[PDB]
Design an enzyme around this catalytic site. Structure first.
Site, PDB file in Angstrom:
ATOM      1  N   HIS A 237       2.249  -3.137  15.308  1.00 29.86           N
ATOM      2  CA  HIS A 237       2.645  -2.045  14.422  1.00 29.86           C
ATOM      3  C   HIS A 237       2.813  -0.762  15.242  1.00 29.86           C
ATOM      4  CE1 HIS A 237       3.144   0.324  10.745  1.00 29.86           C
ATOM      5  NE2 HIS A 237       2.094   1.086  11.069  1.00 29.86           N
TER       6      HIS A 237
ATOM      7  N   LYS B  15       0.803  -1.237   0.000  1.00 32.49           N
ATOM      8  CA  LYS B  15       0.000   0.000   0.000  1.00 32.49           C
ATOM      9  C   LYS B  15       0.824   1.270   0.000  1.00 32.49           C
ATOM     10  CE  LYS B  15      -0.340   1.212   4.741  1.00 32.49           C
ATOM     11  NZ  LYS B  15      -0.279   0.775   6.142  1.00 32.49           N
TER      12      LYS B  15
ATOM     13  N   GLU C 220       6.917  -5.690   8.339  1.00 37.03           N
ATOM     14  CA  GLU C 220       6.104  -5.139   7.262  1.00 37.03           C
ATOM     15  C   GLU C 220       6.568  -3.707   6.920  1.00 37.03           C
ATOM     16  OE1 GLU C 220       2.425  -5.219   9.515  1.00 37.03           O
ATOM     17  OE2 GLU C 220       2.138  -7.326   9.282  1.00 37.03           O
TER      18      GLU C 220
END
Ligand SMILES: *Cc1c(COP(=O)(O)O)cnc(C)c1O
Ligand SMILES: *Cc1c(COP(=O)(O)O)cnc(C)c1O
Lengths: 387, 387
Positions: free
Chosen positions: A179, A62, A256
């Site tokens: 995250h 993304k 990520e």
């Protein structure tokens, strides 16, 4: 010198010509354009392998879904963090196997969960009991990763209940993800997250899961502007990983990263299309990319951009209070509210470095203003290394 | 019953079936979708002809550039306000003559000015001396409209200088435009703008121009939520126009409405894809359109949206504090921060009315989330009237 692959053209840099030099060469309709250095992505990959040798990077698509970027990362061996059916189709369409994809969206449309099950994508995240109910029906054999809080994230006080609910539904839970995000200016937040993850691994053992996957998320800086450097974060993460997740345990550690890989690879060149003078006193400059386009990052990503001139500095030039605006017929399409710049002219270029992350991915063609063309470059040494 | 034209399909409403009824019918993958009532646009046009009979509307294409909308408006006789080459190509591609276009962007890229000159679009706005220099070189015979302030707008204190500069360059200046905008909650701002425009027409006479075009801009409401009604504004504009710009003078009055024509024509249906419970106490609902998509309007247009349930109300149902979030893996993709709603379930639909303006036009596919399909409908009586 150039090469073609995966529907993109890439110029190979030969002497000691750099991406900046190519930019100048193109300047020497005058639509805005980018120069994207694919060699910078390989540099970032080498730096990652050195800084976090035990952590496999799953690129967050993304951030920047440009085909050439995804193709390059695939070629050098990254995994991919996909959040939708379209993102999974993109990665699988470039020949990446389902085993190199994590469907790291905790709240997924049921049809899209069915899509992942049909295409062999087994690893997904979750953080809620309704998500487990959906997975029971639409992808019963999936391998789930529990997303914990540091919109998303299960508390430590509520993770045990979820793990028991997963066992009741005969769903396999293989690990934990977190995250921290890029807003954080303290490396200790990553350390605390690793410690919280180990608490959840131990809870999962009590419930009957033998977790093996730790996913440390994103937020690592991709540009030099950021105060907190990448290696300042990694240098404190490594000892935490060794303490809480020793390699002897068989644990697999992944991350990520998004902006880390691509922020500095893209430099945007915009042309000054219009100009007003408010009284030599102050100047207003209008450029051909704006907040509905590449500079949506100022609104969605809270990004801080900095206008650089393309022309070489001149001795003792006068500086003036100036403002820089986008091309749309919208009064709030303003890029830089106030800055000090020499007097510039229509047809002059302004450069915006570190424009690869959360820029092109969220741009629109509002008011009919088109997306800047992207020209890819790569050094000779990096081209050889990638192959 | 349906018809096809200009690459779009439109269902004709027969009994006393309304656009809302079609919406329910489609609900009776579950991707978000719109129902767009082209009949509502013709209703808005009739209402405009009645309320402002002396003012020709030039639709602001940037509000909503859907091909069917532009095709419909063309068919019923509006002009178009275009701000870019792409917008001009759209309108001319639907068969609209250059005489029905105003290039109402005061700060235009030179290549795009050259495009308008090559395609016969003569009427453009300006508000700066550099814009006149550009027009001298790239479209010397254009017919210019001076945009005055009520980013854009020349002051009354600086308009005389511009008019003299235009005469020096042998550029024809045919009129004045202003734009109050939709933020205004007072009809008297429109009245003052008309009075300021007449001052500029008189200055232009002294300089040697016989202005004939008055452009009153946009900002007229297209939805009933707005406090200030359309007819509250028009009822005070008409006497001002008659006072300052009598019809006997030969003056031509035009406007640039955007949201007026299309806001209420579109209703968005989104599905609840995911759900969390924070302790029956409070609920968090995730839907399949968000702030990078249709709800960019909350950030760019400062819009105020309101979630309506699609299912019929039930007697004595319990209401809970709730939040509504978009589908992206971005912590700020939140649509409604706090609202009171009955307990809803995954697979249930929520409806967002008055979603035609500044919604689809600025949506992106960030994170791979696709744009909702748009289904067009039109009553039988309106279909006949349009032809
Ligand atoms: C967006 C996001 C990432 C990527 O973030 P960066 O700041 O670009 O590294 C990774 N994981 C999750 C869950 C995200 O939401
Ligand atoms: C955007 C805008 C319009 C249309 O505004 P609405 O509020 O949609 O009516 C018209 N003219 C100008 C100059 C604009 O900037």
């Amino acid at each position: 010198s150039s090469f073609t692959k995966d529907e993109f053209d890439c110029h190979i840099l030969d002497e000691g010509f750099t991406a900046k030099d190519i930019l100048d060469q193109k300047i020497n309709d005058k639509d805005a354009f980018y120069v994207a250095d694919l060699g910078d992505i390989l540099k970032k990959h080498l730096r990652w392998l050195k800084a976090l040798p035990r952590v496999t990077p799953f690129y967050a698509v993304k951030c920047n879904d440009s085909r050439a970027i995804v193709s390059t990362l695939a070629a050098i061996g990254t995994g991919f963090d996909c959040a939708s059916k379209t993102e999974i189709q993109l990665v699988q369409g470039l020949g990446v196997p389902a085993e190199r994809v994590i469907y790291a969206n905790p709240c997924k449309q049921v049809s899209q969960i069915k899509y992942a099950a049909s295409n062999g994508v087994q690893m997904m995240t979750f953080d809620s009991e309704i998500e487990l109910m959906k997975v029971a029906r639409a992808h019963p054999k999936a391998k789930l990763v529990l997303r914990i809080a540091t919109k998303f994230g299960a508390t430590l006080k509520t993770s045990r209940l979820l793990l028991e609910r997963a066992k009741e539904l005969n769903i396999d839970v293989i690990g934990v993800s977190f995250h921290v995000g890029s807003g954080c200016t303290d490396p200790d937040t990553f350390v605390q997250a690793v410690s919280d993850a180990r608490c959840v691994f131990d809870m999962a053992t009590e419930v009957g899961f033998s977790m093996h996957l730790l996913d440390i998320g994103g937020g690592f800086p991709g540009s030099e502007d950021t105060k907190l450097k990448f290696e300042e974060i990694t240098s404190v993460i490594n000892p935490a990983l060794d303490k809480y997740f020793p390699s002897d345990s068989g644990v697999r550690i992944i991350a990520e990263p998004g902006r880390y890989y691509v922020a500095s690879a893209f430099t945007l060149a915009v042309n000054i299309i219009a100009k007003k003078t408010v009284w030599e006193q102050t100047f207003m400059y209008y450029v051909n990319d704006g907040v509905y386009g590449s500079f949506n990052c100022i609104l969605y990503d809270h990004a801080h951009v900095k206008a650089l001139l393309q022309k070489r500095p001149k001795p003792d030039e006068k500086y003036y209070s100036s403002s820089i605006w986008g091309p749309t017929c919208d009064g709030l399409d303003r890029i830089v509210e106030r800055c000090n710049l020499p007097e510039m002219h229509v047809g002059d270029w302004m450069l915006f470095e570190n424009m690869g992350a959360y820029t092109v991915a969220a741009a629109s063609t509002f008011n009919g203003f088109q997306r800047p063309n992207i020209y890819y470059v790569m050094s000779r040494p990096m081209w050889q290394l990638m192959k």
